[PDB]
């Protein structure tokens, strides 16, 4: 009975203040120069794109490369709006589940209607995998279609659910420091747990690779 942890009971509030300012604000962090040589703070933004434009280009190699100049705009928005919110009292728009159901469905259904305007038969004859055995036709095409319509829900809900899960352990491990007016040795160890956990919460960049990329595979496979 040496080190008694404490807790504080307080509501954890994802309120909704004025959003249409907060969305526009990580656009003005990135400038664009009309010059040949630039000014050594855009120049490391301009290099960072020319890496990861050479990995969502290499797989496709089609005349579906026209689509890929948009997919690098999709990575900078939720790459920024997940990285701004680590600050003391900032607010992330990708916390709320509303816009992510408007980021999945106008993009996911832009893929199944891409081959249906050109191929019209073999896009969803990709439901036929192989040299058909007899015992498992109805066990297959009720499975590979129930794992198609999961994909818009599978794409949005994986983003909202772990981003907000980062924010609660920021509060709760952090709030247990404030309410630790018992023995002062254990206060540092909870603080040292925080400054490790904030390094893990720069996997909010790592979770945007797993949103543009499984949009490519959900584009490359259909087209």
């Amino acid at each position: 009975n040496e080190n008694l942890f404490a807790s504080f009971i307080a509501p954890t509030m994802m309120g909704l203040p004025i959003v249409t300012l907060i969305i526009m604000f990580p656009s003005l962090l990135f400038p664009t120069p009309k010059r040949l040589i630039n000014n050594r703070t855009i120049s490391i933004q301009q290099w960072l794109i020319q890496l990861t434009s050479k990995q969502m280009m290499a797989i496709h190699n089609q005349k579906g490369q026209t689509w890929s100049l948009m997919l690098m705009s999709l990575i900078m928005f939720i790459g920024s709006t997940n990285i701004l919110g680590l600050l003391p009292h900032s607010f992330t728009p990708t916390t709320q589940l509303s816009m992510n159901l408007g980021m999945a469905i106008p993009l996911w259904s832009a893929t199944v209607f891409t081959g249906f305007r050109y191929k019209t038969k073999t896009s969803l004859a990709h439901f036929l995998p192989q040299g058909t055995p007899a015992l498992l036709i109805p066990m297959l095409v009720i499975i590979e279609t129930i794992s198609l319509f999961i994909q818009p829900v599978a794409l949005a809900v994986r983003l909202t659910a772990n981003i907000t899960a980062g924010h609660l352990l920021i509060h709760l491990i952090g709030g247990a420091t404030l309410a630790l007016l018992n023995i002062n040795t254990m206060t540092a160890f909870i603080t040292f747990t925080i400054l490790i956990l904030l390094t893990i919460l720069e996997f909010a960049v790592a979770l945007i690779q797993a949103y543009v990329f499984t949009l490519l595979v959900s584009l490359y496979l259909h087209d």
Partner: protein, 72 residues
């Protein structure tokens, strides 16, 4: 009456993460034996450690999503 049922339905919901507590244990133990064979770590071998980590934590944390909704 359902005040306990608020608890155990949350108290049982949390142990569904116990897969992904081991599922990332595979992908980091399985990387060092993919690395000691072939020391080219700056290539795409380390890039398949994080996407395997992120796709496993994507199925990791949202099991705790159903935990809070039963509470709150």
């Amino acid at each position: 009456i359902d005040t306990a049922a608020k608890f155990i339905g949350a108290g049982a919901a949390t142990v569904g993460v116990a897969g992904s507590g081991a599922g990332i244990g595979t992908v980091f133990g399985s990387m060092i034996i993919g690395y000691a064979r072939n020391p080219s770590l700056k290539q795409q071998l380390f890039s398949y450690a994080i996407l395997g980590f992120a796709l496993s934590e994507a199925m990791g944390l949202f099991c705790l999503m159903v935990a809070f909704l039963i509470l709150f």
